[PDB]
């Protein structure tokens, strides 16, 4: 199948840098306005300022649903930059975290629905995430989120084997013998359910990851979470099953959640309950 995506080259002069949202180990990400050459339009973005920035624009450029990030183009600057639609909530795992007592049932449950469509698309693409996490879901609205970090995904035929990397969400042949399929990432979209039904406990909070294989192969799994009937934590343990083609598929993940949010309050139980164009609309 030959990837005809197109990689989109952009002028620096056609962005304005606006402020500075996060620093380190990545570059630093600055949030601004992209004004395309005689356009009369301005697109919010998300500028990150070398054959690692090269690899994930690939797989970016070559990803196009409404629950994976837009990558809109880069710039070849004595420093590379990544330019995506400006997501502007932030990151899911903070968003859950700050707005706790204001998160409904229907929120989480269709959270969980657009995750897995995004990961069904990506298994459509034969591609393989490895590392689905509330902290790689970026927030639109807290209606519409994308999956994002494609700093380890990969294209592919099977499997894929490995040469940090982040274990907690990881399945156990993962762990074992770097063994990663799209049932591996279904493993990971357990644990992302859960931080966000915990809204963003860490799993096994203080506990060595060393440990963690020993633990798994033992038959401990993170417990459920206080908000959550059994049938919701049934989907998370299914996720979790040692056996990689017992797990869930995305596609039917996608249903029995879909199910569970036309009735939301059955599966979850919580006391409460002017140029300007988004990059969605910019094709
Ligand atoms: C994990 C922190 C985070 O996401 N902060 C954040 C992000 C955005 N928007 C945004 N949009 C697209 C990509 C990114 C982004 C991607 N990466 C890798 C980042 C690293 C650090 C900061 C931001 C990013 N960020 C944004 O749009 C206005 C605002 C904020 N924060 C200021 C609000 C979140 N605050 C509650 C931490």
Not at 121 to 138: Q, T
Not at 143 to 167: M, S
Not at 169 to 198: C, F, K, N, P
Request: with cysteine.
């Amino acid at each position: 199948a030959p990837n005809q995506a197109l990689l989109r080259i952009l002028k620096e002069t056609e962005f304005k840098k606006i402020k500075v949202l996060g620093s380190g180990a990545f570059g630093t990400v600055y949030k601004g306005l992209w004004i395309p050459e005689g356009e009369k339009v301005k697109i919010p973005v998300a500028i990150k300022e070398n054959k690692e920035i090269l690899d994930e624009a690939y797989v970016m450029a070559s990803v196009d649903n409404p629950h994976v990030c837009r990558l809109l183009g880069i710039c070849l600057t004595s420093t590379v930059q990544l330019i995506t639609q400006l997501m502007p909530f932030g990151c899911l795992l903070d968003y859950v975290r700050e707005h706790k007592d204001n998160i409904g049932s229907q929120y989480l449950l269709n959270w969980c629905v657009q995750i897995a469509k995004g990961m069904n698309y990506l298994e459509d693409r034969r591609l393989v995430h490895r590392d689905l996490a509330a902290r790689n879901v970026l927030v639109k609205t807290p209606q519409h989120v994308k999956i994002t970090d494609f700093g380890l995904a990969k294209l592919l035929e099977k499997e894929y084997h490995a040469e940090k990397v982040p274990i907690k969400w990881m399945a156990l042949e993962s762990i074992l013998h770097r063994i990663y399929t799209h049932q591996s990432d279904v493993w990971s979209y357990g644990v992302t359910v859960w931080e966000l039904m915990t809204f963003g406990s860490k799993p096994y909070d203080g506990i060595p990851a060393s440990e963690i294989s020993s633990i798994l192969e033992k038959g401990e799994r993170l417990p459920q979470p206080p908000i959550c009937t059994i049938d919701v934590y049934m989907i998370m343990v299914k996720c979790w099953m040692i056996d990689a083609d017992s797990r869930p598929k995305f596609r039917e993940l996608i249903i029995e959640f879909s199910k569970m949010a036309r009735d939301p309050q059955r599966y979850l139980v919580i006391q409460g309950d002017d140029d300007v164009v988004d990059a969605d609309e910019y094709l």
